[PDB]
């Protein structure tokens, strides 16, 4: 079974406490991208990894346990294929002309306005996007959709939060 197999790999990657900290995550992701020069990026920074751990830390332990890390990794490899798939110029980044497709391929159909804000927050001057940026953007977008669906219990397409819930959802991200 693939899951048991991953349990095994995970025991080698997890820290002393058998969860993966933001620093351990950063170190694993960087060793992996380093073997893939065709993926352009300045590296995954510690701030971005702390953010990714936070949005993925649904049981609020402070780090990624096996299930969380497996969920994350599966998305990363699924999204990393789309990346290589839309790097037509094989520039090592997704040109601005291919990003709308890329997001589409990952299953994201988003408004023209929200799309531009995301581009502003994650792309370069050229409007192109590198690897850690593409990946970190997707982990968050994915997490914010799930978060929204999880909070909309009655399924009305609208959620309600008080100041405490709002600060928790936005500061722990």
């Amino acid at each position: 079974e693939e899951v048991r197999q991953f349990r095994r790999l995970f025991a080698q990657l997890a820290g002393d406490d058998m969860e993966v900290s933001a620093t351990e995550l950063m170190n694993i992701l960087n060793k992996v991208v380093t073997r893939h020069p065709d993926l352009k990026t300045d590296g995954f920074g510690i701030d971005t990894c702390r953010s990714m751990v936070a949005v993925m830390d649904s049981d609020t332990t402070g780090k990624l346990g096996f299930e969380e890390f497996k969920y994350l990794w599966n998305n990363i490899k699924k999204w990393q294929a789309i990346y290589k798939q839309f790097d037509v110029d094989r520039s090592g980044t997704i040109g601005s002309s291919e990003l709308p497709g890329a997001f589409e391929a990952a299953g994201f159909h988003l408004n023209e306005h929200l799309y531009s804000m995301i581009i502003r927050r994650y792309s370069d001057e050229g409007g192109n996007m590198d690897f850690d940026n593409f990946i970190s953007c997707l982990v968050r977008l994915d997490a914010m959709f799930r978060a929204f669906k999880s909070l909309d219990k009655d399924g009305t397409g609208q959620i309600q939060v008080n100041i405490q819930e709002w600060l928790q959802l936005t500061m722990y991200s």
């Binding site: 790999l9 990657l13 694993i28 073997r35 893939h36 993926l39 990794w73 990393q80 294929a81 798939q85």
Partner: peptide
């Protein structure tokens, strides 16, 4: 090593 495995998941 576990790194090698993860790295092999990359298309």
């Amino acid at each position: 090593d576990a790194i090698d495995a993860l790295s092999s998941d990359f298309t």
